[PDB]
Amino acid sequence: FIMEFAENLVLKLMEDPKERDRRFREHVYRVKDRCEKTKEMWSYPMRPYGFWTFERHNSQLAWDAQISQVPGRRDPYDDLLQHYS
C-alpha cells in the first residue's frame, strides 16, 4: 500500500494539464494584447497634433487681451478717442 500511497501523493502533486493549458492560453493572449497596446502607445509622436491650439500653450492671448488697456501698451488713437469721449 506504500506504493499506492506514493502514487496518490504524486498525482496530488504536479499540475492539471487542462488548467495548465488554459492558463497558458490566457497568459499568451493577454501578453499579445498588451504588447500591441504598448506598441501603439510608443507610436505616438512626442509633439502632439493640437499643441498649438491648447489653452495652456496659448496663454499670452488671454493675458494680453486683459491687459490691452494699460497706458504702457495703448494705441495712441484709442487714448485720443477715450479723451474725446
Binding site: 498649438w52 496659448n58 494705441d75 495712441p76
Partner: protein, 65 residues
C-alpha cells in the same frame, strides 16, 4: 513680441504678432499661418521691402550707366 513699445505706446507690429498668434491658436495646420509669420518677420527686419528698394536703386543706377 510684447506690446510694450519703446515710447510707451503700442508696439510697432504687436498687431502683426497677435494676428499670427490668433491664427496659430485657431488653425488646423501650422502652415496655414505661413503668410502671417512672413508678415511678422518682414515687419521685424524689413527684409523684403529693403530688397525691393535695393533692386529699384540697382535698376536706377544701371540705367544711368
Amino acid at each position: 513680441a510684447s506690446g510694450w513699445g519703446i515710447t510707451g505706446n503700442k508696439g510697432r507690429c504687436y498687431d502683426f504678432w497677435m494676428d499670427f498668434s490668433e491664427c496659430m491658436s485657431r488653425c488646423r495646420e501650422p502652415k496655414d499661418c505661413g503668410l502671417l509669420r512672413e508678415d511678422y518677420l518682414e515687419c521685424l527686419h524689413h527684409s523684403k521691402e529693403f530688397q525691393r528698394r535695393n533692386r529699384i536703386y540697382k535698376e536706377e543706377q544701371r540705367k544711368i550707366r
